[PDB]
Amino acid sequence: FKFGGXXXGG
Numbered sequence: 614f615k616f617g618g619x620x621x622g623g
Contacts, residue, residue: 614620 614623
């Protein structure tokens with residue numbers, strides 16, 4: 614996952 618302030622793990 615990814616959003617405007619980061620993420621990871623898909």
